[PDB]
């Protein structure tokens, strides 16, 4: 709709967070009074890490994604020193913080998150976007507690990576299915399945898919996670098979 955006279009409120390359602020568009988030990135720190190339790709991808479980990028503008991203505001914060607060999630909250993530990822895959880096700190929560995926030679965070990535083999969209498995386990248990005191041990556990469940994890949850965490990418479910998994349908909430 809107020809172009400027800082003067927004009232600014409190800092919502400090990112790597600047800060995120609460904001409000003046004509509509709609509440948003404004992410300010300092160009200098972007050069100083050569992230710029990715930002370009992020902005262009996230620009064309329209999904209830993916954080909207409404628009952007820049000045001499800063890039500004106009984002959907997620008032309930990151899943990372909620998990720190609660230690672990019940089956209903987990199954809901997993449904929302699988729907988001299915849409992405249909647009030939692979996320490859979903972890709790990149998941935000909307006003009804709905999950929003935030972020679109550093491969990732070891605990969340599949065997094919850590072992330097080729990979494709099936990596996101592995991630879903790790996330489901972490949500229920409070830590990811291959967590260890050394990265050497984590590496080995992933490569051999060696993990176990605490005794409170139910048969249904175990069945889903064990399908997701297959060494062979080919043998991992399709996202549509996650959405219809019996544990998912028994436990997930339907969008508000």
């Amino acid at each position: 709709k809107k020809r172009q955006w400027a800082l003067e279009d927004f009232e600014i409120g409190r800092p919502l967070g400090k990112g790597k390359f600047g800060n995120v602020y609460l904001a409000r568009e003046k004509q509509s009074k709609f509440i948003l988030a404004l992410k300010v990135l300092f160009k200098a720190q972007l050069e100083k890490a050569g992230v710029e190339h990715q930002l370009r790709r992020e902005v262009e991808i996230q620009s064309h994604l329209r999904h209830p479980n993916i954080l909207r990028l409404y628009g952007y503008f820049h000045d001499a020193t800063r890039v500004y991203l106009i984002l959907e505001y997620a008032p309930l914060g990151t899943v990372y913080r909620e998990l720190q607060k609660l230690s672990k999630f019940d089956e209903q909250r987990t199954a809901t998150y997993i449904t929302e993530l699988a729907n988001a990822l299915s849409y992405c895959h249909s647009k030939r976007v692979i996320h490859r880096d979903i972890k709790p700190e990149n998941l935000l929560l909307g006003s009804a507690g709905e999950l929003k995926i935030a972020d679109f030679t550093l491969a990732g965070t070891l605990d969340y990576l599949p065997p094919e990535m850590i072992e330097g083999r080729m990979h494709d969209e099936k990596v996101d299915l592995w991630s879903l498995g790790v996330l489901c386990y972490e949500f229920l248990v409070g830590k990811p399945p291959f967590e260890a005191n050394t990265y050497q041990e984590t590496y080995k556990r992933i490569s051999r898919v060696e993990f176990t469940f605490p005794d409170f994890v139910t048969e249904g949850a175990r069945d889903l996670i064990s399908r997701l965490l297959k060494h062979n990418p080919s043998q991992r479910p399709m996202l549509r098979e996650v959405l219809e998994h019996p544990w998912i349908t028994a436990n997930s909430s339907k969008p508000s």
Partner: protein, 82 residues
């Protein structure tokens, strides 16, 4: 090509120590690196495909080596015939 070739020599030596073997290094066929974050740190891994002689016969191996260049650190993760 330089620090890599060394790394390969190191992988072969660590294999020889771990497995009580006497492999002789020949050359590097292929080599990749990736970096990972773990907790608050970063680690690189090299993926080397090398030829070495086992009892005189040239064979292809893949080594994976952890490298933290900052602390003069390196460590064989795995070493396997292709």
């Amino acid at each position: 090509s330089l620090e890599i070739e060394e790394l390969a020599r190191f992988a072969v030596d660590e294999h020889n120590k771990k497995e009580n073997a006497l492999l002789e290094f020949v050359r590097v066929v292929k080599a990749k690196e990736q970096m990972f974050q773990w907790r608050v740190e970063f680690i690189t891994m090299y993926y080397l495909t090398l030829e070495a002689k086992d009892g005189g016969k040239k064979k292809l191996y893949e080594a994976k080596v952890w490298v933290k260049a900052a602390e003069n650190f390196k460590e064989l993760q795995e070493f396997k015939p292709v």
